[PDB]
From a paper:
The canonical [name] complex acetylates histone H3, generating primarily the epigenetic mark H3K14ac3, and consists of five core subunits: the catalytic subunit [name] (something about silencing 3) and the nonenzymatic subunits Nto1 (NuA three ORF1), Eaf6 (Esa1p associated factor 6), [name] (yeast inhibitor of growth protein 1) and [name] (transcription initiation factor subunit 14). [name] is a core component of several chromatin associating complexes that regulate gene expression, DNA damage response and cytoskeletal organization in yeast cells. Here, we report that the [name] subunit of the [name] complex binds to two other subunits of the complex, [name] and [name], and describe the molecular mechanism by which the extra-terminal domain of [name] recognizes the conserved motif present in [name] and [name]. The plant homeodomain (PHD) finger of [name] binds to (or reads) trimethylated lysine 4 of H3 (H3K4me3), whereas the YEATS (Yaf9, ENL, AF9, [name], Sas5) domain of [name] recognizes acylated lysine 9 of H3 (H3K9acyl)11–14.
To gain insight into the binding mechanism, we co-crystallized Taf14ET and Yng1EBM and determined the structure of the Taf14ET-Yng1EBM complex refining it to a 1.9 Å resolution. In the crystal structure, Taf14ET forms a head-to-toe dimer, which creates a deep, elongated binding groove for dimeric Yng1EBM, and mass photometry data indicate that the Taf14FL-Yng1EBM complex can also form a dimer in solution. Each Taf14ET monomer, colored light blue and wheat, folds into a three-helix bundle and a two-stranded anti-parallel β-sheet linking helices α2 and α3. The α1 helices of both Taf14ET monomers (α1 and α1’) are packed against each other in an antiparallel manner. The α1-α1’ dimerization interface of Taf14ET is stabilized through van der Waals and hydrophobic contacts. Dimeric Yng1EBM forms a long two-stranded anti-parallel β-sheet (one β strand is colored yellow, and another is red), which pairs with the β2 and β2’ strands from Taf14ET monomers and is restrained through extensive intermolecular interactions. Symmetric β-sheet contacts are observed between the backbone amides of L122, I120 and L118 of each Yng1EBM strand and G218, F220 and I222 of the respective β2 and β2’ strands of Taf14ET. The side chain amino groups of K115, K119 and K124 of Yng1EBM form salt bridges with the carboxyl groups of D223, E219 and E191 of Taf14ET, and the side chain amino group of K123 of Yng1EBM shares a hydrogen bond with the backbone carbonyl group of E216 of Taf14ET. The Yng1EBM-binding groove of the Taf14ET dimer is large and hydrophobic, and two molecules of Taf14ET almost encircle the dimeric Yng1EBM. The side chains of L117, L118, I120 and L122 from both strands of Yng1EBM are oriented toward and essentially buried in the hydrophobic groove.
Author numbering:
A (entry chain A): 176 to 243
B (entry chain B): 1392 to 1403
The structure:
Amino acid sequence: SVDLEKLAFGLTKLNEDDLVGVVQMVTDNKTPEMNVTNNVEEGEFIIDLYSLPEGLLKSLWDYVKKNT
Amino acid sequence: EPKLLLKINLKK
């Protein structure tokens, strides 16, 4: 089970391209219930890891480990 | 109860 606070911290350790890749993976897998905010006008995303399913969280964690 | 929200601002 992914530690969500370590995930959130580790996500900020990615470079710009890899963090965009996180945004890509999340928007491609998102449903309304995962409470992802995407202000399309402002080009900003707000990810609530606590609303993501465990498989996506695991994919994000492995992605962080692979790219740091 | 603490929650870390991750805000990501993209290039426009």
